[PDB]
Every structure is written in C-alpha cells, then in structure tokens.
Amino acid sequence: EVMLVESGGGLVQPGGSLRLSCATSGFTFIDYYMSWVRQPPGKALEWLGFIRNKGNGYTTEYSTSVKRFTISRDNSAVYLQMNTLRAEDSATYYCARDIGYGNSPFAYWGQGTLVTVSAASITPPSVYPLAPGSMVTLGCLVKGYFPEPVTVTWNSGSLSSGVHTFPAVLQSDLYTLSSSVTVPSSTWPSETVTCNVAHPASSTKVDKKIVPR
Amino acid sequence: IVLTQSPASLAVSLGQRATISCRASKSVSSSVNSYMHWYQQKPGQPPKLLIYLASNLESGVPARFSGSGSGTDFTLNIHPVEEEDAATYYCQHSRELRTFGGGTKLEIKRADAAPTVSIFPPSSEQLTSGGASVVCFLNNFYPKDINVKWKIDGSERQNGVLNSWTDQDSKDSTYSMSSTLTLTKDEYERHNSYTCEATHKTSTSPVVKSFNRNEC
Numbered sequence A: 001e002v003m004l005v006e007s008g009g010g011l012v013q014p015g016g017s018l019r020l021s022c023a024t025s026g027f028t029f030i031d032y033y034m035s036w037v038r039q040p041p042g043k044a045l046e047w048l049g050f051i052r053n054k055g056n057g058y059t060t061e062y063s064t065s066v067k068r069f070t071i072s073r074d075n076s077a078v079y080l081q082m083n084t085l086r087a088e089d090s091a092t093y094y095c096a097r098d099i100g101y102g103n104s105p106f107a108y109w110g111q112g113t114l115v116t117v118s119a120a121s122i123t124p125p126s127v128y129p130l131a132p133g134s135m136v137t138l139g140c141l142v143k144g145y146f147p148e149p150v151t152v153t154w155n156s157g158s159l160s161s162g163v164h165t166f167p168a169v170l171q172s173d174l175y176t177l178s179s180s181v182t183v184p185s186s187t188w189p190s191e192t193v194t195c196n197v198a199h200p201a202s203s204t205k206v207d208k209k210i211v212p213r
Numbered sequence B: 001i002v003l004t005q006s007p008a009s010l011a012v013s014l015g016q017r018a019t020i021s022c023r024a025s026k027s028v029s030s031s032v033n034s035y036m037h038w039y040q041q042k043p044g045q046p047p048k049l050l051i052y053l054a055s056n057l058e059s060g061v062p063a064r065f066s067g068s069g070s071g072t073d074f075t076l077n078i079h080p081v082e083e084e085d086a087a088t089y090y091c092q093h094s095r096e097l098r099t100f101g102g103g104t105k106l107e108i109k110r111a112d113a114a115p116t117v118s119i120f121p122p123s124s125e126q127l128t129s130g131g132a133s134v135v136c137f138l139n140n141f142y143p144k145d146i147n148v149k150w151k152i153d154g155s156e157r158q159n160g161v162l163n164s165w166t167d168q169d170s171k172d173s174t175y176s177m178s179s180t181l182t183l184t185k186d187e188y189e190r191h192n193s194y195t196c197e198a199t200h201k202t203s204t205s206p207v208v209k210s211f212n213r214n215e216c
C-alpha cells in the first residue's frame, strides 16, 4: 500500500556533497510532512529534519546537528541535500512519513540508503573457501573490499538453515567478513556446497565452491 | 529536550517481563496527548513503531507490548517476552525536535550452550596470493561473553586477528563469533601448530580446536 524508497547513497569523499532521494506511493503525498532520520552503524537513530505539507507552506525544519543539510520535494519524491560531508555523516539514511491529519508519524519507513564518507577507494572482495583440514561446518572468507555492503548466500539460498554471516569489520580501510554454513554430513562432500558473494559497489558476483582438501 | 532511556541493556527470561524506561528533561504531554513513541528495531531493518502517544498499540502490534506514563516519565513493558523480542528498543519525542532516546538492547535469556568450534587452514587460493588466514567459527553459544586466543606453535598472537560477533539470534537466542588470524604466507609456512582457544562459561578449561600444518 504505502511505499517509501530511498536512493542516492554511495561512497563519497570527505568535504563532498550528496543529494539523497525518497520515492513515495500509496498515499496523498501532498498532505504529509516528510522526515529524514539517520543511523550510524551500531548507533542510535537521529532525526535530521522534515519538509511540511501543503497546508503548512512546504517549509522545512532541521535538527541542531545539521541545520548544512537541505530538504525539498517534487509534488512524489522528497530530497535530502548534504554538504561538507564528514566521518560522522556515515550512516544508513531513512525517509519516513511524518504527520498528516491524524495518522501516526514514523509508522512508515523506507529500507534506507547507505552513505559512506571516506577517501578509500571502491575495492572488490577476495573470496576464499573454508574447508575442514554428523554435521559439518563450512565457510567463506570475504576479504579486502570497500565499501559495504556484501551479501552472502549458500547454494543460491537453498541452504537457509544453519547459516551464520558475520558483521563486516574494517581494518586499514578494507572490510573483512565471513560466513559459515552447517550441513548434514550426508550433503557434503557427497554433493557441492557453494557460497554466493555479491559486492554491488564493485559489480562483483563470485560463487566459490567448498571442495575437500 | 533530553530523553534518557534506561537501562541501556537488559536480559529477560522467555515469558517474563521486560521494563524499559524513558525520562524527558521536560514534559511531553499536551492538554490531550503524551507525545512519546516506542520503536522496535531488528538488525538490518528500519525501526518498527510499536506504541504511539505513550499508550496506544499500532495496528497489528501484539498485546504483550504495553506503554504507560505521562509528563516526563514513560515505560515500555513487554510481557510475556517472546524469542523474537530480542532487539533494540527506542523511545522518541514524537513532536517538536523529535528527539530519540539512546536505545535499549533486549536479550532473551535461554539455557547455557557450549560453542560449536571449527577451525580452517588457509585456502590454496589465498596462499597463491601470498597471504594466509586461519579462521575459527564459534557458533550458537550462550551466554554472550566469550574470549578467544590464537596460538602459533604455542606462542600467542594478537596482531592480525580480526573478530566479529553476531547479534543475538531472533529464533534460538544464541550468539556466534568468527575469529580470523591473518599472517603472510612465509610466516604461516614457518610454523606448525595453529590453535583456536575459547574461554566460555560452559567450560572450566579452554575449548580448543587445532591443526598441524605439516599434517595437512
């Protein structure tokens, strides 16, 4: 029914500028305030500002922390213009439907768009199979990429149970993550188990088979 | 305005009561409504609105969620807690400057569980590139507290160790950990015994997984 879709998030250099957009449908856009909220990885949510509805003259209000950012709208998309970007701005950015004429504000949120403020360059991952030297644990090591995110599936999603994909950790401007899968001894090495790694930022898709030593 | 959420963390047994507090520096009550929201947020997802205007359930939100309070003092109660309730919760002033509280991470307690530990030597493809990572997965354990040490021929190594921990699983309430020791190929090939050692509540002595490079 109601839909919000953030776009425009990517890797951006410090001191740089970016404009994020939020695509809306399923409600009368013109009657609603529209807010932007961010969240640095592993940190609290932070309201940034809103643009008001027609009845209140499409004016804007901002938080103390960014009053540097600018909000605007196409009457059905809403924008966030970000200037002089720095480290603290690195976050997932959300749009949310704010107050209209009674409906709860912040009931509807988009999926967010990831903003990464860094001088480090986009780098594809190296993918390494982790094979053992009743139930067997296999894994993949995804090393040396930038920026986030990368996604991992096993056997194209066919292996859904017993998967652990670990949060990425940054070291010297390169990310590392790993993923493990635990399968019955009857599936492997009898048949093949593959980790499927994707890094949309570098346009990388790698499928790595875990072959016995 | 300042919103002070406490506690920042709490653990509650399945089917018991979770009580989370939010105090405002000034009253957020108008002559009609108290402008306090409560959210639930799970890893990789936007926040979910549970409670609007302090005491009202958003449509479809289970009855176990309850909000109370007025003025400056508010409370989110969850009873009986479910396994899926493992999450971070936020209060927020739902008008004016729309200030979020700092958040509360809720753990759902479960029976103790020893980590399933697996060790992996460097892949032949990593070695070809001149690098060597030894990986250790410590999976599906409880409680959360765990310590891992790497040893190369009995000599502890910390430089080049990268650790990552998952959030509490939403379904089985366990935690998992990954520890990756990165070395150069030349150092790897200069040593034999490689050992992942884990200290956890479930054992009085380290849980050990090992391989010897020249037995490979």
Ligand SMILES: O=C(O)[C@@]1(O)C[C@@H](O)[C@@H](O)[C@@H]([C@H](O)CO)O1
Binding pocket: A052, A056, A061, A099, B094, B095, B096, B097
């Ligand atoms: O700034 C406004 O347009 C607005 O109407 C937004 C509301 O959420 C609320 O904050 C209101 C007044 O501040 C009510 O006190 O201002």
